[model samples]
Target: VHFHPFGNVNFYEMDWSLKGDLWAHAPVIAKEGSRWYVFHTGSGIQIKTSEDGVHWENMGRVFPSLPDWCKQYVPEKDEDHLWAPDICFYNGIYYLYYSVSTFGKNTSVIGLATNRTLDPRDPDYEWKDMGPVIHSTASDNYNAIDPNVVFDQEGQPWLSFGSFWSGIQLIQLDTETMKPAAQAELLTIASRGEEPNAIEAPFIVCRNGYYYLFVSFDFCCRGIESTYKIAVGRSKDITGPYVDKNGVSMMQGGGTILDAGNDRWIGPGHCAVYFSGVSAILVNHAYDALKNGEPTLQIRPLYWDDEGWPYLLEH
Candidate 1:
């Protein structure tokens, strides 16, 4: 994997034959009182920890294991597709955001839970389920999956979301209340023709005053048939009219920054950004063709030329 400073883009295999079966995604690795904590999902939102990014220990399941009235639909065994989760520490609490729904459907919802600390040893670390914090319906014209939490210049919380429906959508969030504010507005992003809309999973970043919105476009999760790739567009405003170099608005079909044929990875979406002064990373996944079933992880360092666009040097 081609990675820089903060750490290299790396993949560690998870084997159910050895440790029992558990699918993981939306991994949020954070520092908890000098140690590392990793938050992800499987049967329900689960937590794990590591002193270093390598060796890890399971913490246990988070969120309510029981169904609640607030939920519009009860989670069936197959209905538990709680995918692509992210964690952010805000106001002395840890907020875990997750997608709740089946794949490629607009029924997806974003939920939140707060924990005082990630360390299992800490009695105050109990995670409280705030329940479905954000969501959308079939009538909304957009999806509610693939959530990424980002902070704006003034330090307010904003959510960058949507996938496979009406493109990427962004909205202002009230960090304290953990609710959508009145100012919440949908931002039009990259599209693919008029149907089979692309642009899934978005990762947002602010560099030199520009809000760069990075997205993964094309197909995903079809095993060997997966053909996903990464792409990007940016705008000065958090709510954007982002476009590509060819001048195609991201809201309409646009030129790509990276495509499956060029990148050698299929279904490369669901990502994160880790940065330090003068150093940045594009942390994402790709399907390991060698794997027999489900998509396996593939990570690489993202390099940029003088043009300010990111590229995988390993590509």
Candidate 2:
């Protein structure tokens, strides 16, 4: 493989496999034409591009430095690092949402940046900082981070985000502005009943008339010692009493376990789901025990049972 002068590698000649790219966290995937792009947690919100979904190459980042307005919410926030970015294309424009905060603090903000194209070669390519979309203070009941945007069946936009404190939260967005609607009420979707809460990264998708709420349970960011796992609950309505396969309310600590790491990969969490034709894929980061607890990107086929529950084929 050849390396770019910027220090990122070009994996164009590499084979299609999960082992191709190994560093990333809380990854979200999007496609423009045949090119696949991954926007994940890192300094300036790391960006990677893949001609095919399996072979990836680092393509720099969304921002060279933190937005000027970030200091309004996180005055002492590090300018280099940004966390858990979610990208979506709406009304012919790309809206990239990201998290900014001091580690271990509830004082956080979810910011937005818009771009005309993901292609760097496009003359119109430019990331425009739209500033803070939402924020949380020390007195707030929830931490605002890990934002995921999904459109409901009726084409209504909704944002889901949270970590620790009060767990996963959902709020409706204004389509014209692509921000939270002034009249929208924040709703709690999922949580662990106990202290440290330990659940975060809420992603929801609509499939076959069911709205599935996927979340990461337990702790993350501890490397090899992390206890993160992927879990899910589904409901017929967007905002509702979501329940696991065994019928436990997500609000009261209920989720069907989707993945818990084996030996090589530990603490699998912060997942994103996408569909290509009839096939669905699950993408996330897992701590590689053999590689010094390094965070590695993982991709696997997602299957649905006759009963409509989702499962991953044996990796």
Candidate 3:
């Protein structure tokens, strides 16, 4: 016997927060107030909202139309599609750093989108485009995509971004405007020595008196052929000299492998790390082999070992 009144009942449901019709790439999450918001690659920056992280529903996007100013920096960028948005709440405002660029060139800009709160129902729920924060041209030798914001021990904000051109770049952010200060010096924090210089997606979490830098190595977006993997290095100072487990510098291809793709889940990268009190969760996207090599959202608990190194808590 089945339900007579209700059309159908989903008695059993796995926690597929972002499955089926919705697919996300380079997703970064933040919890402002109580609601959890995910800003990822899509037209107008696709947003997914969740009351609990396990159950999510589509929440439209941050912008209804493309910001007119994007074309001023990236002449080729005309579409509303945006990529690799990073979210972090500082002080009272939530700062969203997003990438605007086309393939093949470094004429990319990381723009800032700020909100008073992530709650869509709130009267003040509106995303204010604060214009561009960091820009990289063909002559600059840097790709300003995959932006991540990290606060240092001194309460200073630093933005890290890159995709390929010269590894990851870090610049200090001003407290007043949340943009790079006039005197801020750009620094290269991490890179791979091998050919292709195949590292990007810089995510930093300050823990155990060390600044841990997590990055992606190898190629991504190749579907089943993607060779993407995740690695990590640590430094005492925010502006690295980050090194791997054996103390080899990150610039010399030194990173402890955090995750390499298995046959089931291929090529995981573009990750974000979040801490709740003492518990930490690592989030990213990986291609699902069972599917059509589509990128699927992945979340796993991160635990610190006795030696204070982060490891995935796989059951």
Report the C-alpha lDDT of model 1 over 1-315, residue by residue, as the tens digit.
Answer: 011123332322212121222234445556654465556656576666655544556767775553363357424325444677777777777777777777656765788778887777877767787877677776877888778777877777778888877788887888667667877766655566568887778877776677778787777666567777778777778777776766677888764566463334456666676564545545555565555435433334455557666666545
| 198 Cα displacement, candidate 2 (Å) | 0.8
lDDT tens per residue, model 3, 1-315: 110011122212223344433367898877654466677888999998776565667788888888989998898886888989988776678888899999767899999998887887889988998999989888887898889888888888888889787788999989889899899998988888766889998988888799999999999888889999989999999888899988889988989988897888899888988776556667888998988998877766777888778887442
Q: Write the per-residue lDDT of candidate 2 for residues 239-287, one digit (tens) a residue.
A: 9789999999999899999999999889999998776544567789999
Clashes of each: 4, 0, 0
Clashes of 3: 0
Largest lDDT belongs to which candidate? Answer: 2
Off by over 4 Å in 2: 1-16
Instruction: Estimate candidate 2's alpha-carbon lDDT, on a 0 to 1 scale.
Output: 0.86
The alpha-carbon RMSD values of the candidates against the true structure, listed in the order shown, are 5.2, 5.7, 7.4
* Model 1 residue pairs with clashes: 2-301, 189-250, 190-250, 228-267
How many Å off is the CA of 137 in candidate 3?
0.5
Per-prediction TM-score: 0.82, 0.94, 0.92
